[PDB]
């Protein structure tokens, strides 16, 4: 198997430059050249150059021609991908992908693909609020309580409730991108309301690029 | 140039799905397919119009007519829901045109209906000088809802923000909806309520002040 294993996710801000790496495993680099592809979220794909391993000429889309440049290394079986002038609208995945001289004219083999976030917002700690159940709830039935994860700029928030033992009910939802650029997120239980006030609902808001280790209690509503 | 396709196409198992691509006169040109689950990399599935790699399953074959090329995946089964694209290479600009993507749906699931909770502000948030209203919807199918707020009774278009659906550990679709307000505003419009319609069917949650 040939394999293209990408660089993780980057996190940059508009006006800046970003590099992503696609290495090829195995046989020799310079054998069969491979490609780039961006796909903006829930869009679809979009193509944006070449490069030749051997002849390292590049070829690119008029979209992004001067802004991109794509380079390659010989020595660690890589290829390049840089984007000049970073805007907000390149919030994508870029993905690498190789065409084999001969069979034929697509990409037999893809990359795993690398998130680039892309806004103006900074890295921020998470706000927590919580959540009260049905204020009455004494002979009711079933109720939701949870936390409210608001405002942070990096999305890997990460919940659990007391240290992991709950786990029945637990729907933890993703996060939305409020239109200053910023995360906010919600987890929420589901339980019987006869225990009410005999365990326990704590839960640990974790922001590890923050280190932000938050707990917030959610009793009933008082 | 400009590959074209319908968004959406729904085939139940068993029945062939033939995701069409239209491009300007699509002569024998090197048409190829990929295919794209939720969350991973397009996957090569057809190539050179009707060729396949190695190890993609034989239901796959592809068709590349006159004015339109078509993929046909017959038997269609319910591992193959995903988004798939067209592609050729344009001469006139030297380019790699992708299709606009097709979301295959495949069905074998009743219609199901939303769970709609809802969480005023907190006593904690107000006491922050914030007011931010919690619509989760969970437990339902067709992946499309359309949601709107209501404000005591009084129509609203302002401060709310709303996640798209997802899958859950269930095959059913689930998506968030927020709401940020003014703390004047919570306490003189006497209840809030999240209006949630999902194919035409609306469900509702209550609650007031304290």
């Known amino acids: 198997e040939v394999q293209l294993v990408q660089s993780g996710a980057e996190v940059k801000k508009p006006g800046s430059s970003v590099r992503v790496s696609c290495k090829v495993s195995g046989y020799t680099f310079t054998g069969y050249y491979m490609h780039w592809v961006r796909q903006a979220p829930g869009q679809g794909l979009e193509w944006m150059g070449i490069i030749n391993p051997s002849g390292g000429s590049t070829s690119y889309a008029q979209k992004f021609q001067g802004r991109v440049t794509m380079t390659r290394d010989t020595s660690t079986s890589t290829v390049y991908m840089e984007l000049s002038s970073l805007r907000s609208e390149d919030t994508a995945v870029y993905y690498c992908?190789?065409?084999?001289?001969?069979?034929?004219?697509?990409?037999?083999?893809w990359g795993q693909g690398t998130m680039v976030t892309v806004s103006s917002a900074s890295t921020k700690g998470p706000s927590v609020f919580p959540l009260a159940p049905s204020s009455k709830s004494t002979s009711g039935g079933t109720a939701a309580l949870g936390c409210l994860v608001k405002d942070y700029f990096p999305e890997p928030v990460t919940v659990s409730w007391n240290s992991g033992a709950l786990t029945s009910g637990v729907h933890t939802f993703p996060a939305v991108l409020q239109s200053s650029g910023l995360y906010s997120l919600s987890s929420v239980v589901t339980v019987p309301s006869s225990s009410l006030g005999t365990q326990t609902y704590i839960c640990n808001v974790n922001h590890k690029p923050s280190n932000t280790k938050v707990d917030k209690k959610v009793e009933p509503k008082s | 140039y400009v590959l074209t396709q319908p968004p959406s196409v729904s085939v139940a198992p068993g029945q062939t799905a033939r995701i069409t691509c239209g491009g300007n006169?699509?002569?024998?040109?090197?048409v190829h397919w990929y295919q794209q689950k939720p969350g991973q990399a397009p996957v090569l599935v057809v190539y050179?119009?009707?060729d396949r790699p190695s190890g993609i399953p034989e239901r796959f074959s592809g068709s590349n007519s006159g004015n339109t090329a078509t993929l046909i995946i017959s038997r269609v089964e319910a591992g193959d829901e995903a988004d798939y694209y067209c592609?050729?290479?344009?001469?006139?600009?030297?380019?790699?045109?992708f299709g606009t993507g097709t979301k295959l749906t495949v069905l074998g699931q009743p219609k199901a209906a939303p769970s709609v909770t809802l969480f005023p502000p907190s006593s904690e948030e107000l006491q922050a000088n914030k007011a931010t209203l919690v619509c989760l919807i969970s437990d339902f199918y067709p992946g499309a809802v359309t949601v709107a707020w209501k404000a005591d009774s009084s129509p609203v278009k302002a401060g709310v923000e709303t996640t798209t659906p997802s899958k859950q550990s269930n095959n059913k679709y689930a998506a968030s909806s927020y709401l940020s307000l003014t703390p004047e505003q919570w306490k003189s419009h006497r209840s809030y309520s999240c209006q949630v319609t999902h194919e035409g069917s609306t469900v509702e949650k209550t609650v007031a002040p304290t």
């Open positions: 992908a190789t065409v084999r001289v001969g069979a034929s004219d697509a990409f037999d083999i």
């Open positions: 006169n699509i002569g024998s040109k090197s």
């Open positions: 592609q050729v290479w344009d001469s006139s600009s030297v380019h790699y045109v």
């Open positions: 050179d119009d009707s």
